Design a protein around this ligand. Structure first.
Ligand SMILES: CO[C@H]1/C=C/O[C@@]2(C)Oc3c(C)c(O)c4c(O)c(c(/C=N/N5CCN(C)CC5)c(O)c4c3C2=O)NC(=O)/C(C)=C\C=C\[C@H](C)[C@H](O)[C@@H](C)[C@@H](O)[C@@H](C)[C@H](OC(C)=O)[C@@H]1C
Lengths: 530, 543, 542
């Protein structure tokens, strides 16, 4: 019997080439006066390239107040990336989409800026105090040219390749308090980029045409559950997700965990911030709180009843001249005077600790509560919104002054962790006919399983064929029949009107990957498959 | 320029070269995928059986089977929580069959074992603090657990090479049958919880999803499939045999505990936190309540068998050869510090060796709270292991014990939890203790393989990139789907048609309760079958 | 719910490749077996294990795993094993035949190749049982229980399983394993009897491999990458690799040299190996001498120690640095004291001082009447990974105008000996980047230069590793199925060597870390051709 050899193979002689890591400085242009970096790659010996890495020199941050960078700061800096030739754009991506494509890559995410040095909230006490030390971050600009290394690489057929990087405002990548002088920081801050790539000098290159997937995104109107992608002729995939819109707020939040980014870390940071005003050890009724505040003295039993909710408060080593007090309405929301009230104090069941005579403060030991990721994600503006018949924010001025501005451009869902799924039903139509529909997030489950990711989206994959070696499988259009567009309609999950999160404005994001043919006939050019 | 002169000169034509910078983009088979979800037909030894029928002219092929399950709202009084990876634990057996019979089938535990290295699949099946932490109900209408939906990835051989490996429907009807384990297996609860009503009210609500493919002019070729078979040996017996082995790709060997001789009750459980340290810390925390007592005079509410001793001025309490250092701050003048010297004890003879849990503690420090009237422990020095946390309560009070055994308070005993997890391995909750001292595999009369160390487990973990492997003998190192798998071939005439497994178990102390944990040997064999798509899908055992 | 009408209508002459079915090819008839062998131990009287593989059945092999039997450690003192103990045991591994060495690697290079394999690292010995520092109280007390560790000897024969496997053409294959002294793999204090342990300790190895009995094997020649390392002279920022004719890659990194010290360190975190774990362990060790609750001025400290009573406001000023100390439940007869110069360093009197006490800003806690000790709650400090990595010898060096170590005798007795052979950079985590510039010359011409560690970023990205090195990769061609792409020599032009020049950043002379010696490591992977014609043999590509 004829047998295939599994113990030996003919070591084929490959194309004669030589790689080199090339680093280039850019040309900065302020064009809405947005920072734009341009990198021109033109050399007769750079035959092909891939693995684009953009480095960024973050400056020394000096002065007073609270300051920190958003996690994966390097990716958050990116607004748009374009790779173009003389014939036009070869490939381009939106900042968030590049990040989404790199969310599984722990190494790329770490390189972009994910450390306690960068992401923890540091405090500066004097005008010449160093808040943050200068650092360099590296952003892996993942392109379709990296899929199969040399086989997939961008070939430069004697053409000039321009890599354009559009940057987001520094407001988006920074978490700060009112005390921090952001006005001066915004004026003084400048993006310092450098583009690196693996260049290949190839001897007698044999160029063949290839296929590329170019992502397109469409953002629907504020609170609009529909979005449409026009002129769809050959699509490999379609992703659907939601983003919050905070334009109706001052983008201020009570707490932030810093480098520690788990759901529990977000919750613990919030609890810690509230505990300062929640349980007070004072000689007589506490002061510095608004008139709307209902601070009740804890009885001998330790139980304070806020309607049907019982809060057990027991503090050790309390001085004889002092008493234990509980703020029964620290944060409250109500649309009507005779409606359900969402009270944050009611989310606490037990608070234990010991009063320190030396530092004159309470040292909390164990806290029993029901605080969730949504509570930590509520903007402060929504607690004091017009819709609320109550004051809302009954915290001290000291606590309110510690509030942080978060303008992270890549937030998904209605919480900081994208934990809460707000899509109750998804409907995708090709033309007018229903292409796909679901009541459960089964497309997200398949995305997470097939891509081995923990942070996936509701994705419809049409290409299950191996990349580069095969022409990708695409959903083909029929203009005559009307099937030349992908229309998405969602049904948002119904939330209680008396909860502050109900008023978070939502935006539907639809991402479509269209197939293009790469032609190298007299320069690099792409053609949309139609 | 950008390229260095040294590189340029080094490069700047006679030999034939393979192109590594470009490739001919081959046109693939014209197809269209679709995520299809189906509702089942529920049937009821009164075990739940869900049936899903897949029959469509246009569903040419399928793969990536995912079973969703709607978990109900749990209301009432008592302690309740779901086992980790609840979705997998629900599964007793999965079968994929056609008109010609079974195409592929797996046992619940084997599907779980095949998915243990997939963190995503495990998370989807139900692994969260919301599901797995032990929640408490205070009133008959208090919500213990909120309704949730779990997703179970039914990994099949059809997913290995995506479209290439997919199950081709030769215009035949495919039935997917799912047999469910009793709800007792997936739930951790105390005595206070009304399990009787819960068992009656609970219903499995499944839904089968799969990636279906509509293929234009499909060119079908025959393929090969590995079907797993398991053999469970007799209780406490160190042998098991898999008969009729003809063409096997692999053989796995592991141990399972048997708790049929117990009420399946355990002192503690850590919840969502599943590390070895989490299991130990939960156990220590549960005992500390009755171990160190701050009371005005001798403590009450403990059995007569208990020996609660007052801690002397030096802080050292001697329990035979073991010294326990107990020092509690802010103790009221009217009160004293007491140590329970025999919280849990075991012995087979009146004056023999004694396994005392109190003796496993060396130092206990803390501060008494006047406000809450309880001790707040700071630092604990102990030698509590994963085995202690895995001892069923029944064994502490068994007939073998000359002592009372359980000298805990009634309050502590009432907090004990029922754990019926069907996929436990070894003699502890983490499968930490290796109880197999030697393993021998015999293919007839001749020794096929033998080992003193779990080097077969090390190879399994390395080759499968898994952290929780088993002693596995792999015979197929050939790439799957593209090649016919390599197997251990049988010689019927020489009696080499059966795989016999013999183990040498470790010897444990009779005065330690873990000695009485019954063991079962599990042997898993993957048999090679040929998939014939000639007039309906059918399988044939390679013999 | 079934196939949707839109999909059916979309589908309902060109040659198409079948992606739904494939011809299940009959492979070469073979049979694998996990074979385990015992070695031959030989004896600076270095331990060497030899494993001879020669069998008519064994046609080919791969996936070498070396197991090691760690003994029961009994007696007094503090003892622990280094993390990944199994890899740290290895000094060198060589696979040779009658024709000579087929492949060989240095201990550290094998570890470097396995650093991205979490499973291989766990198997080698990474647990609280092995790596935490355990204490022995009686001469017959068990410190560490006996355990078995498994070391995955990653070779080029594992890359493509059976395809890449080492073929044994009726030749005798010898696997030689050289072991590092037991001093390298063990973390211990002065109380521990290392002298007896070193005498009593014996390496107990066992080599396992996946062997293949192949029927009518069809052997073809292959290519192998053999790593070579060159260690530069102490603190010299240059190193050269000679006879470089065809190299697939070149790596550059730094190692510390502690030959000028007794290899003693104040603290070690144990199994917990994060940067924060190293810092927290150090802070915890200093805290008992830093803040003292005593009736009158504290005793048991050298005369050089400046222990100041904490004032009513809690602020103690050490020059420009203010330290806030507030301890609860302090007895009326006792006072709170702060050690203002626990560890200090300076090369000139009345100049800049590096004081560890000055690195603390706030210390809070509660005094325990029951245990007669302070239980610290919150500590605000600026202690870094470098502080935890300073050998004790440097604090009391001749360069220091001060006593340096003003800790108690109790604290000094708890100091641990760390001789880990695979440390990189100038700290235990290799956090501090000490290379400011890298220059690589092929012959006399500049092959590559960088000011930033972009070669390390590329290494980490391409190898999916979190702990990479400045690496220049020349081969981007798939392995086994293709002949690797390499740099080409030109003997006539003198281009047959790789010269590395780095520019190190300079430390402050008044910081003890300036006195930690450095060594430049350059690793070169040369291409060799594997021939099976009358035995297994390798030939260097020119
Ligand atoms: C499980 O996959 C296997 C199924 C095989 O069976 C079988 C019947 O089905 C195949 C499929 C489905 C392929 O898609 C394929 C392929 O795309 C490919 C070559 C050609 N290979 N070479 C021919 C001669 N050789 C000495 C050099 C290159 C193939 O033969 C196959 C192939 C088969 O033969 N690729 C190319 O032509 C090009 C343009 C580049 C290749 C680059 C590197 C070299 C390869 O990717 C290496 C790294 C390996 O990954 C593969 C070889 C896979 O081997 C393993 C163990 O994974 C193999 C596909």
């Amino acid at each position: 019997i004829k047998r295939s050899n599994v113990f030996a193979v003919d070591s084929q002689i490959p194309t004669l080439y030589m790689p080199q890591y090339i680093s280039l400085s850019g040309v900065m242009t302020n064009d809405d006066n947005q920072a734009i970096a341009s990198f021109e790659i033109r050399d007769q010996y750079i035959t092909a390239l891939n693995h684009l890495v953009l480095s960024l020199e973050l400056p020394e941050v000096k002065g007073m107040g609270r300051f920190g960078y958003v996690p994966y700061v390097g990716y958050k800096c990116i607004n748009h990336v374009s790779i173009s030739s003389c014939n036009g754009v070869i490939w381009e991506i939106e900042g968030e989409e590049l990040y989404n494509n790199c969310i599984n890559n722990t190494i790329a995410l770490k390189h972009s800026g994910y450390s306690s040095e960068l992401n923890d909230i540091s405090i500066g006490l004097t005008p010449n105090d160093t808040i943050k030390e200068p650092s360099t971050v590296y952003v892996y600009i993942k392109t379709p040219f990296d899929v199969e290394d040399t086989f997939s690489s961008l070939k430069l057929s004697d053409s000039k390749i321009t890599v354009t990087v559009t940057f987001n405002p520094v407001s988006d990548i920074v978490i700060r308090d009112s005390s921090f002088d952001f006005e001066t920081f915004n004026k003084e801050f400048v993006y310092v980029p450098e583009l690196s790539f693996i260049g290949y000098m190839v001897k007698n290159v044999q160029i063949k045409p290839s296929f590329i997937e170019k992502p397109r995104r469409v953002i629907g109107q504020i609170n609009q559950p529909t979005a449409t992608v026009t002129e769809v002729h050959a699509a490999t995939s379609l992703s659907v997700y939601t983003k919050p819109y905070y334009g109706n707020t001052d983008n201020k939040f009570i707490s932030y965990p810093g480098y520690s980014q788990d759901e529990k870390d977000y919750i613990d940071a919030y609890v810690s911030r509230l505990l300062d005003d929640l349980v007070i050890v004072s000689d007589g009724p506490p002061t510095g709180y608004p008139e709307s505040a209902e601070i009740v003295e804890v009885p001998e039993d330790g139980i304070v009843s806020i309607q049907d909710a019982d809060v057990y408060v027991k503090i050790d080593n309390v001085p004889d001249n002092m008493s234990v007090y509980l703020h029964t309405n620290l944060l409250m929301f109500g649309t009507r005077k005779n409606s359900f009230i969402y009270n944050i104090s009611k989310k606490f069941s037990a608070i234990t600790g010991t009063y320190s005579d030396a530092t004159k403060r309470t040292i909390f030991a164990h806290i029993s509560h029901s605080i969730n990721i949504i509570d930590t994600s509520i903007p402060v503006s929504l607690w004091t919104s017009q819709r609320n018949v109550y004051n809302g924010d009954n915290r001290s001025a000291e606590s309110k002054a510690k509030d942080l501005f978060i303008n992270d451009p890549f937030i998904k869902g209605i919480d900081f962790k994208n934990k809460t799924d707000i899509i109750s039903r998804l409907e995708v139509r090709f033309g007018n006919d229903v292409l796909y529909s679901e009541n459960g997030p089964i497309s997200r489950i398949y995305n997470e399983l097939l891509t081995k990711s923990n942070n996936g989206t509701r994705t419809l994959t049409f290409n299950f064929t191996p990349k580069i070696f095969f022409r990708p499988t695409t959903i083909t259009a029929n203009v005559s029949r009307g099937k030349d567009k992908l229309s998405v309609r969602v049904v948002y999950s119904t939330m209680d009107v008396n909860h502050p999160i109900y008023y978070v404005q939502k935006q539907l994001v639809v991402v479509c990957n269209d197939l293009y043919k790469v032609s190298y006939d007299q320069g690099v050019s792409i053609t949309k498959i139609m």
